[PDB]
């Protein structure tokens, strides 16, 4: 079919770390979040699998194109949009690697902005775990076999909203 | 009939428990609302009744799923949702028990976060003392006696929203 | 007629108190609104009358239901509903009491909540002398001189919201 | 024609006064806007011109109702509404006065309220000096000189709205 | 065309500067560089002839920089002008260097709105991309790109938006 936006939802990362004071060549705390963002060959909750050529592909556009050029933002909650609104973001994708067929990352929470940054930043502090989503661009394959493959030419748009795991 | 989105009040929770410094592991001191968070075999406010065997698996499921995930975020005010919206939690469920019929549990107030967890708190710290609500899925069959039951399936979406009794 | 919003603004109370230290069971300081916040036997400013009986038996209900249970919240602005919305939340009414034929109260503003209480209490500290509008559900009979007069079974359902006075 | 709402721009007040501890009848410091808040006997930019003694008399009514009684809040932005919303208050007059057929008035910028007044203070604080506006009720008459002139019985309800010139 | 509202987005400019005492002192967090482009092929396939650039920024800065008016607001919105209420930098210098527009812009802090989310942004590592907002009419040429006819008006210099 036809390009559509992709959301998908990848669950909880395993790392939380708040407070560690990094160099800033100076020294800058942050709250950090840290695990797995987006996965490979398995079938998502969404019944949606990503091949790894694909999504090697999206994940090394979206690290040059937004990572490495400090825009890579998120937001709290998944809207139906495929950009970031700098106005809503809440994290911002600072690193992206590959473990095996896992796509890990890490990611700064926004704080001071009174607004959603200082949201998840609270929300964080009082306990929560968040989890995260992707969106993207892309179009899907029907298997017959319960499940859609993702088609050639997927494009990665923002790599982590925090969102609240269903 | 069919399932349908069912929110209860359950009246004030009897502690509200400001600034005891409890062990992060430091210290962090916090704002809790401790008491009667649901009731099983009681004809509620709406005319409804839990059977206690149906909350019990409710409960269960929801300990899993979303208070010992760290997921059992809750807002200020029930909306007419099944889900949480994290930009609008006010509350984290910690822990719920059994006492007999009726389920207590504690619930920290998410504060620093410039929106609903601080509304709340602040709401609080001028002597509002709030009532509890919660969101769930099921169906009701009417006895004839003024009172519907709660239909075997039952599932609670949200332990508690913080809420203003009428 | 059949019952209604009732919804009137009854003027600037006299007196507005910042920064007492008052006693917790240590000190807690807090912004004080003091004076007439309903009146019984005049004219108001919506051409209605409240006569005493009707206005008394009202108070006394909403002392029993909402000031001593803790719950006599209200906003900023008064909006076309009957009960206050606890997000908007800006005063809470800790007493009520006759004098004549007014009735004064005293209002604690809702601070640190970075909303309507802490809007409020900034206005205030300005120099903005609010004007109260109380809110209750009830019908009303023409006189053809010139008023209306509440009808038996008035409820107040909201003390005060503070209000720009007209 | 019949009453409408009137909203009037006026320009940027000649003073932004910030931090001078004032002696509250303690010492309290504020950020002020003064100036000219009105004025009359001018074609203003929306080609109107307001008479001296229409103005005199709708300029000593308000500071009668509302800003002796200290009720005089207005805006960030004029909303095309005759009366303040608390809510979204900005500012307060706490004095006005006449200079030849100019209005001119002291206004407080209310901060400390995470909103209008907070952001108009950040806002003047960055270096932005802010433009004024006023609301009222009237109507006007053509004069077929390209203006239209206040009728008798205008009523200033906002003396000053914060507004992006 | 007849006249409508141009905008443009003209990339991340390339200084952030945080915390100079600039002269008592105020500390401020600023965005300095490229604001403005003239005689390039723009992202949206126009291009400003440098003539026509060159009178609006010299409008714009008599006009709202040097009035203390040249508000930007933190995503460039389908109207003409700035709400102060939305504003979340404002510039205080504009400069040409050959034919790039570079401009000096304060983030606007404090104000618990678009101000302070933009500085936290930028603190937490975000670099903007510029916009800006203007009023005239294109000229088609066939060769994929339109040309800003003369009398192009400048209303708002910089908007922070998200680059795409």
């Known amino acids: 079919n036809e390009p559509q936006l992709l959301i998908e939802t990848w669950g909880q990362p395993g790392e939380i770390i708040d407070g560690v004071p990094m160099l800033e060549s100076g020294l800058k705390p942050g709250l950090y979040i840290e695990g797995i963002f987006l996965q490979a060959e398995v079938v998502n909750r ?27 933002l998120g937001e709290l ?23 095996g067929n896992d796509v ?34 892309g179009s899907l394959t029907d ?13 990665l748009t923002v790599g982590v909203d925090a969102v609240w795991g269903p």
């Open 46 to 72: 969404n019944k949606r699998l990503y091949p790894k050529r694909i999504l090697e592909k999206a994940v090394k556009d979206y690290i040059n194109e937004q990572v490495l050029t400090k825009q890579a």
């Open 77 to 99: 909650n998944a809207p139906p949009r495929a950009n970031v609104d700098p106005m809503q973001a809440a994290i911002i994708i600072e690193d992206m690697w590959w473990k």
């Open 104 to 137: 890990y990352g890490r990611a700064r929470v926004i704080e001071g902005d009174h607004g959603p940054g200082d949201k998840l930043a609270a929300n964080i502090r009082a306990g929560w775990i968040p989890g995260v989503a992707s969106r993207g661009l």
């Open 143 to 155: 298997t017959n076999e319960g499940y859609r493959i993702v088609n050639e030419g997927f494009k």
